[PDB]
Structure formats: structure tokens, C-alpha cells
Design an enzyme around this catalytic site. Structure first.
Site, PDB file in Angstrom:
ATOM      1  N   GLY A  13       0.820  -1.202   0.000  1.00  0.00           N
ATOM      2  CA  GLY A  13       0.000   0.000   0.000  1.00  0.00           C
ATOM      3  C   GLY A  13       0.848   1.243   0.000  1.00  0.00           C
ATOM      4  O   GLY A  13       2.061   1.172   0.198  1.00  0.00           O
ATOM      5  N   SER A  14       0.214   2.378  -0.255  1.00  0.00           N
ATOM      6  CA  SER A  14       0.854   3.684  -0.280  1.00  0.00           C
ATOM      7  C   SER A  14      -0.172   4.753   0.107  1.00  0.00           C
ATOM      8  O   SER A  14      -1.377   4.538  -0.033  1.00  0.00           O
ATOM      9  CB  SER A  14       1.463   3.977  -1.655  1.00  0.00           C
ATOM     10  N   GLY A  15       0.319   5.873   0.602  1.00  0.00           N
ATOM     11  CA  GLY A  15      -0.513   7.001   1.013  1.00  0.00           C
ATOM     12  C   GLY A  15       0.353   8.116   1.540  1.00  0.00           C
ATOM     13  O   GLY A  15       1.521   8.216   1.158  1.00  0.00           O
ATOM     14  N   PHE A  17       1.860   8.397   4.230  1.00  0.00           N
ATOM     15  CA  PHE A  17       2.989   7.768   4.898  1.00  0.00           C
ATOM     16  C   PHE A  17       4.157   7.369   3.973  1.00  0.00           C
ATOM     17  O   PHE A  17       5.246   7.104   4.470  1.00  0.00           O
ATOM     18  CB  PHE A  17       2.492   6.529   5.651  1.00  0.00           C
ATOM     19  N   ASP A 135      -0.905   8.783  16.228  1.00  0.00           N
ATOM     20  CA  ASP A 135      -1.795   8.296  15.156  1.00  0.00           C
ATOM     21  C   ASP A 135      -2.333   6.903  15.466  1.00  0.00           C
ATOM     22  O   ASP A 135      -2.420   6.047  14.588  1.00  0.00           O
ATOM     23  CB  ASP A 135      -1.121   8.401  13.768  1.00  0.00           C
TER      24      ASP A 135
HETATM   25  C1  LIG Z   1       0.052  -1.463   3.537  1.00  0.00           C
HETATM   26  C2  LIG Z   1      -0.015  -1.111   5.018  1.00  0.00           C
HETATM   27  C3  LIG Z   1      -1.441  -0.780   5.446  1.00  0.00           C
HETATM   28  C4  LIG Z   1      -1.552  -0.379   6.929  1.00  0.00           C
HETATM   29  N1  LIG Z   1      -2.929  -0.015   7.271  1.00  0.00           N
HETATM   30  C5  LIG Z   1      -0.612   0.805   7.164  1.00  0.00           C
HETATM   31  C6  LIG Z   1       0.825   0.401   6.835  1.00  0.00           C
HETATM   32  C7  LIG Z   1       1.879   1.418   7.252  1.00  0.00           C
HETATM   33  C8  LIG Z   1       1.605   2.781   7.236  1.00  0.00           C
HETATM   34  C9  LIG Z   1       2.599   3.682   7.556  1.00  0.00           C
HETATM   35  N2  LIG Z   1       3.842   3.330   7.880  1.00  0.00           N
HETATM   36  C10 LIG Z   1       4.106   2.024   7.902  1.00  0.00           C
HETATM   37  C11 LIG Z   1       3.177   1.021   7.604  1.00  0.00           C
HETATM   38  N3  LIG Z   1       3.530  -0.347   7.614  1.00  0.00           N
HETATM   39  C12 LIG Z   1       4.422  -0.993   8.399  1.00  0.00           C
HETATM   40  O1  LIG Z   1       5.223  -0.438   9.150  1.00  0.00           O
HETATM   41  C13 LIG Z   1       4.322  -2.489   8.330  1.00  0.00           C
HETATM   42  C14 LIG Z   1       5.202  -3.278   9.064  1.00  0.00           C
HETATM   43  C15 LIG Z   1       4.965  -4.641   9.121  1.00  0.00           C
HETATM   44  C16 LIG Z   1       3.893  -5.161   8.437  1.00  0.00           C
HETATM   45  F1  LIG Z   1       3.643  -6.487   8.513  1.00  0.00           F
HETATM   46  C17 LIG Z   1       3.071  -4.316   7.690  1.00  0.00           C
HETATM   47  C18 LIG Z   1       1.888  -4.815   6.927  1.00  0.00           C
HETATM   48  C19 LIG Z   1       0.627  -4.249   7.046  1.00  0.00           C
HETATM   49  F2  LIG Z   1       0.506  -3.145   7.822  1.00  0.00           F
HETATM   50  C20 LIG Z   1      -0.494  -4.728   6.409  1.00  0.00           C
HETATM   51  C21 LIG Z   1      -0.360  -5.835   5.588  1.00  0.00           C
HETATM   52  C22 LIG Z   1       0.878  -6.431   5.405  1.00  0.00           C
HETATM   53  C23 LIG Z   1       1.958  -5.910   6.073  1.00  0.00           C
HETATM   54  F3  LIG Z   1       3.168  -6.481   5.888  1.00  0.00           F
HETATM   55  N4  LIG Z   1       3.291  -2.995   7.635  1.00  0.00           N
HETATM   56  C24 LIG Z   1       0.913   0.053   5.348  1.00  0.00           C
END
Ligand SMILES: C[C@@H]1C[C@H](N)C[C@H](c2ccncc2NC(=O)c2ccc(F)c(-c3c(F)cccc3F)n2)C1
Length: 274
Positions: A13-15, A17, A135
């Protein structure tokens, strides 16, 4: 080098962040998450112990790194000409709390208790380490489906915890407190407790209680689902209009609704494996 050490998988994903990819550490095949953030998109910058300019997120994740599994571990980080790259631990299988709630609807109170307790333990760990997340929400909570363990993610809007007023905020508006909406001012702990009330309501009702600024300011809680009196009381307490009226972490965890929590493995056995 970075792309010699890690095999890049699909975009997750992206946004706001940045961009997050699934990945694998080449050496031991360890599952990782690879986060890319452009330098231009970073407003809050921190200093590494040995004086290196880095995004606040790196400073905060380093401060909360330990054996405790309630916070996502930062495994490594890299600087590029116009970006930063973060390598994070990745549980497998995993699902964020937003997707879990979308799929299941409102959670049974026994499940909501286990989940909420674990996020309180994670937020207490951050605060004890001098880190304020800013957040806390379902999208920033990951479920390690096999272990029934929850992990806090995304410290990109965070700050060092302080006892004076915050006048800056880049977290999620619908989880932000009425003092932020009205005066652009809030204190760390009481603003965190407000977001926790929003999150607990989200878990037991399947959606957030407030959408508009006017609703946040009014702070009148309507229950759209059947919720126990004790759970409704804790939610309304976390959502008190006056910040000083909100419970401390100790008062939340001593609340009668929070007693007899399931262990994470029992939670996975009853609610996740099934
Ligand atoms: C695709 C994400 C959607 C979230 N709702 C938010 C996630 C996010 C946002 C901002 N900064 C960092 C992040 N992600 C992370 O640190 C991070 C670290 C370990 C993880 F296992 C994941 C992860 C997830 F979150 C969802 C599905 C699969 C994954 F591997 N993410 C990205």
C-alpha cells in the site's frame, strides 16, 4: 547495499505515509516490510545519538526497540539521495485491524477486550520510552493472526513525549481530540487517551463515533450496536470533553470492563484460528 540484502515483493500500500512493500531478507529468508518515504514529504526530523539527520520515525522506532512484541521492530534503515528506506519486521500471516473490522463487523466484547488491552500495553511501552505515537487507529494496528498478538505501526506522525503543550499535529483528524479541533493545542497523554476511546468504540461498534468537527466538539456518544454498560462507561470516560477528566492508563487497565483479559494465544484459539 540495500537491494542486494533484500528481495522486493509486491507493493502492500501507499498514502501520506509513503510506499510500503512486502520483502524478504536474502540471507535468512526473514519476512520484512520495506517502507520508502521521500525527503520532501518529511516535516519532522530527528537527531541520531551520534548527530545524524534522520526522519523522526527512525528516532522513535529506535527508542522503542526491545524484546517486547507490542511495537513493530525497526530492523534496518537506509538513506538515499531523495528518500529514506526503513526495514521493518513482518509477521506472516498478518492483517491490519481496519481490514479485520471491515471483514468481521463489530467485535465481540471478549475479543475487543483482548485487543484493547494489548494496544494499551504497547502505548504504555511507547510512553515509558519517551515516545508519543499521535496516530493510534485501526489502520496502524497489525494482528499477528497465528499468535493473537497486536503490533503498533507507523510512527511517522509521532514525537518525543513532553509535558508541555503540542501545537502541531499531522495524525488522523477523526481520532484527534476536541482541544486540537478548537484550539490547535493538546497534551500528549490525554490526546492519546481520546484516540483510544475512538479506537475502542470502533472495535465494539464496527465504525468510528464521529465524522465531523462539530460532532468531535460536542462529544456526544451514540451507540449504534448493543454494547455493555461497563464498556459504554469506559468509552465515554476516554472521550471526556475536558482533557483532565480522561482516565490515565492505570485507570483504564483497572476499569471493571478490562478485567479477566484473554491471553494472546487463547484469543487466537477462540477468535482467530476458528
Ligand atoms: C500497507 C499497510 C497498510 C496499513 N494499514 C498501514 C501500513 C503502514 C503505514 C505507515 N507506515 C508504515 C506502515 N507499515 C508498516 O510499518 C508495516 C510493518 C509490518 C507489516 F507487517 C506491515 C503490513 C501491514 F501493515 C499490512 C499488511 C501487510 C503488512 F506487511 N506494515 C501500510
Amino acid at each position: 547495499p540495500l537491494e542486494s540484502q533484500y528481495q522486493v515483493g509486491p507493493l502492500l500500500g501507499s498514502g501520506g505515509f509513503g510506499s510500503v512493500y512486502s520483502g524478504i531478507r536474502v540471507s535468512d529468508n526473514l519476512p520484512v516490510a520495506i517502507k520508502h518515504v521521500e525527503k520532501d514529504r518529511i516535516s519532522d526530523w530527528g537527531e541520531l545519538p551520534n548527530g545524524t539527520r534522520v526522519p523522526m520515525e527512525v528516532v522513535l522506532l529506535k527508542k522503542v526497540s526491545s524484546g517486547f512484541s507490542g511495537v513493530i521492530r525497526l530492523l534496518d534503515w537506509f538513506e538515499r539521495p531523495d528518500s529514506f528506506v526503513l526495514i521493518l519486521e513482518r509477521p506472516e500471516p498478518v492483517q491490519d485491524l481496519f481490514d479485520f473490522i471491515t471483514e468481521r463487523g463489530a467485535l465481540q466484547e471478549e475479543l475487543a477486550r483482548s485487543f484493547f488491552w494489548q494496544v494499551l500495553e504497547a502505548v504504555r511501552h511507547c510512553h515509558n520510552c519517551g515516545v508519543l505515537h499521535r496516530d493510534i487507529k485501526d489502520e496502524n494496528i497489525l494482528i499477528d493472526l497465528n499468535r493473537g498478538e497486536l503490533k503498533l505501526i507507523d510512527f511517522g506522525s509521532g514525537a518525543l513525549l513532553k509535558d508541555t503543550v503540542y501545537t502541531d499535529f499531522d495524525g488522523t483528524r477523526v481520532y484527534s481530540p476536541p482541544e486540537w479541533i478548537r484550539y490547535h493545542r493538546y497534551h500528549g497523554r490525554s490526546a492519546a487517551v481520546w484516540s483510544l476511546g475512538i479506537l475502542l468504540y470502533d472495535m465494539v461498534c464496527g465504525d468510528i463515533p464521529f465524522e465531523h468537527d462539530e460532532e468531535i466538539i460536542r462529544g456526544q456518544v451514540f451507540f449504534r450496536q448493543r454494547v455493555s454498560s461497563e464498556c459504554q462507561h469506559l468509552i465515554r470516560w476516554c472521550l471526556a470533553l475536558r482533557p483532565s477528566d480522561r482516565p490515565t492508563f492505570e485507570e483504564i487497565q483497572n476499569h471493571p470492563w478490562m478485567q479477566d483479559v484473554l491471553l494472546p494465544q487463547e484469543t487466537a484459539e477462540i477468535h482467530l484460528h476458528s
